[PDB]
Structures are given as C-alpha cells and as structure tokens.
Write a protein that binds this ligand. Structure first.
Ligand SMILES: Nc1ncnc2c1ncn2[C@@H]1O[C@H](C[C@@H](N)CC[C@H](N)C(=O)O)[C@@H](O)[C@H]1O
Length: 368
C-alpha cells in the first residue's frame, strides 16, 4: 500500500530516517523514496499492510496512517495514494485542455474502493507552479469526476466543511497527485500547545529537523534567541534528558514561550531567561549545544543584522562546547560572523520555511 508523506522542502532525508525508525518498530517491510517524481516536500512510502491477530483470534489491520499521524514530529500530512502521474505540458496546456486531462484521469480511478459510496466527501486541492487554471478549478474538475464516478455505484454524499473523507488533489509543476488525506484540514505542524503566536515563529517540523541535525547526546541545549519557544518545547516534548535553556530579548515573547510551554506540559523542564544574546557569556559559562531560528531582519538597515550576528557569534565562541544549528535568510551576515569568529561549517542546507528559502547551518569551533 502506498502513502504520500509531506513535509517541509529540503528536509525529506530527515523525514525519511524519522519514518523508518517508526515503521521498523511495527515489524513492517517498506521502502521510501525521497522526492517522488522530483517533487519536493514529499516522500512516497511503500509498505505491506500491518497485520496482527486480534482478541477473537482474527487477522486485523493496524492503521499505518494513524500510527504516523500520532507519532511523527516531521511530517505535515499522511495521504493514502490513489495515483501519482506526470501530465507532460499541463501548466502550458490551455485552461480547458487542462481540466480535460484531469477529469479523464480521475474518472479512470477506482475511487469507489477508497471510500464507502455512502461516506461523505470533499475535495481539497493544492496547486503550484505556473498553470493556466486555478487551485479552485482543480477542486471543481476533480470533484465533478469523483461525484459522477461514485454515482454509478450508489448515492454520493458531498459535504465541504465536515467530510468523513477528504480527497486531496495536488498539481505541482507537471505532477498530479490524487489521494485520501488522512491527516485532515489541520496539518500535523499545527501544534495544540501553540497558544501564543509569534509573528516569526518556527514551524514545528523544521524545529525537529534542527534538533535531528544537531545529533544531541544529553548535553545542555540553548536557544539564545528563543522567541515563542518552539525549538525548546519540541525538544522537551521529545523527553530530552538534558538541560534546556532559552534566552529571549523581549519579555512579551518570553512570557509567550512560558505560556506555550505551560500548555505543552513541559514548562518545568525549560529554563527561560530574558536576556540579550550579544552578551551571552553573562548568562552562561558553558553549553554543549545552541539551536536557533535567527531573526531574518526583513527589509533593510542601514546594517542591523550583520552586526547582531557578529556580536552573538563572538559571545557564542566563548561558551559553546559541541555544535550550533542555525537558521536565517541572511546568508552573508551569517557566514562572515561564522568566519570572523573561528567557527567552521560542517553542514549547510536550504529549506522552505513557509514560503521563503531559508539557510540552515551546522557549526563547531575550529580548534575543537
Ligand atoms: N540581541 C538579542 N538577544 C536575544 N534575543 C534576540 C536578540 N535580538 C532578537 N532576539 C529575538 O530573537 C527571536 C527570534 C525569533 N525569530 C524566533 C522564533 C522562534 N524560533 C519561535 O518559533 O517562536 C525574536 O523573537 C527576537 O526577540
């Protein structure tokens, strides 16, 4: 059986390792492709069905979708795949030749075997790249064809806001995807603990991607520019055995982070300090790790950020024992701050954070 698993662009390999460790525990055989068909923010999972013997002595299925929904920290959506196809030249086909290609394609799909003729259903679409039709055209064309198809078999029941079964149709570049979205209208990154909403907060999946890349070992972990608290809370909710510390310049944000941590059940295990990271060595003497989503300093200045990174990183030099994991839009400010201060890049990545192409670096001190 086949699942399309989504996550942030540029973290597919991290999401893969995450997915394996999890399914291995079930005993399942499976195989996982990064970026099926070249599309980013995706994994195509192939597994055998997960059977056990139940209380009645009967073969019973274990939901793999449920298992992943419940336990993954990196995934956005778990979708049961019905088909994945390239439509050559679609975004360059004219509006009506496009809807045409779609409907005829979907009309062929045995969609009745994925939904009970008599469950409710909606379509939700995601469209992307340059096309001649809208995202709304897809939900429309795809919806027509599911409804028409299901009719042959009975009485189709449509419900936009409270479906029991969401079909999701994605068209990205020239790749079309149709599937059953098991995750729902709220994507997995939408955390219940997030009661204070930071204007520049880290998407929780990318937070765990930073945690993984750090290769933590029980040593103390610091978010010097913590904000809303995302990175530290994710790490506490992973049950991390080490000290966890967050420093945040602005009180409002820091009290937000404490409220977020209260709502997540982990406020006890994080030490939250109002404080200024360019004076870092006043707040601490030693930390094994530092993990931060740095302020991107949008707009200009005329030179705000270069100077912020330069000081912070000089302070960091003073206290860091193992590794730093950092995220920023400001490629230049960061790499000079890194260079001038005797840090060494041991990993660099590009990631899609919401809609911006962010840089992620892993660093150590040179002389270590
Ligand atoms: N000199 C400084 N020292 C410490 N923190 C700072 C300093 N300058 C800015 N900050 C904070 O850095 C934080 C960076 C945020 N982008 C972090 C978002 C956070 N990762 C979250 O998910 O909620 C901002 O909330 C700023 O208040």
């Amino acid at each position: 059986m086949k699942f399309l698993l989504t996550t942030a662009q540029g973290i597919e390999d991290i999401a893969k390792r995450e997915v394996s460790l999890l399914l291995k525990k079930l005993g399942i055989s499976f195989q996982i492709e990064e970026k099926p068909l070249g599309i980013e923010g995706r994994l195509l999972l192939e597994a055998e069905k997960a059977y056990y013997v139940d209380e009645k002595g009967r073969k019973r299925e274990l939901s793999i979708s449920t298992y992943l929904n419940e336990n993954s920290r990196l995934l956005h959506r778990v979708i049961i795949e019905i088909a994945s196809e390239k439509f050559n030249g679609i975004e360059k086909d004219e509006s009506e030749e496009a809807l045409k290609r779609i409907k005829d394609f979907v009309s062929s799909l045995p969609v009745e075997q994925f939904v009970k003729v008599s469950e409710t259903f909606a379509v939700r679409s995601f469209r992307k790249g340059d096309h001649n039709i809208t995202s709304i055209d897809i939900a429309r064309t795809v919806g027509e064809a599911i409804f028409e198809r299901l009719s042959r078999f009975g009485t189709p029941l449509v419900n936009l806001d409270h479906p029991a079964v969401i079909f999701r149709a994605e068209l990205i570049k020239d790749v079309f995807f149709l599937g059953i979205d098991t995750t729902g209208d709220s994507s997995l990154h939408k955390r219940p603990w997030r009661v204070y909403d930071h204007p520049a907060h880290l998407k929780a999946s990318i937070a765990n991607a930073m945690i993984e890349l750090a290769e933590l070992d029980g040593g103390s972990v610091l978010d010097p520019m913590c904000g809303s608290g995302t990175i530290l809370i994710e790490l506490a909710l992973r049950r991390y055995s080490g000290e966890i510390i967050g420093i945040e310049k602005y009180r409002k944000h820091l009290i937000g982070a404490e409220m977020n941590a209260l709502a997540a059940g982990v406020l006890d295990k994080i030490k939250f300090i109002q404080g200024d990271a360019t004076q870092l060595s006043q707040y601490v003497d030693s930390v094994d790790f530092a993990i931060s989503n740095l302020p991107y300093g949008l707009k200009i200045g005329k030179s705000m950020i270069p100077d912020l990174y330069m000081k912070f990183f000089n302070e960091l030099a003073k206290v860091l024992e193992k590794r730093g994991v950092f995220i920023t839009t400001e490629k230049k400010a960061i790499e000079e701050a890194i260079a001038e201060n005797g840090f060494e890049i041991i990993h660099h990545r590009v990631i899609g954070h919401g809609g911006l192409m962010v840089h992620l670096y892993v660093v150590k001190l040179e002389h270590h």
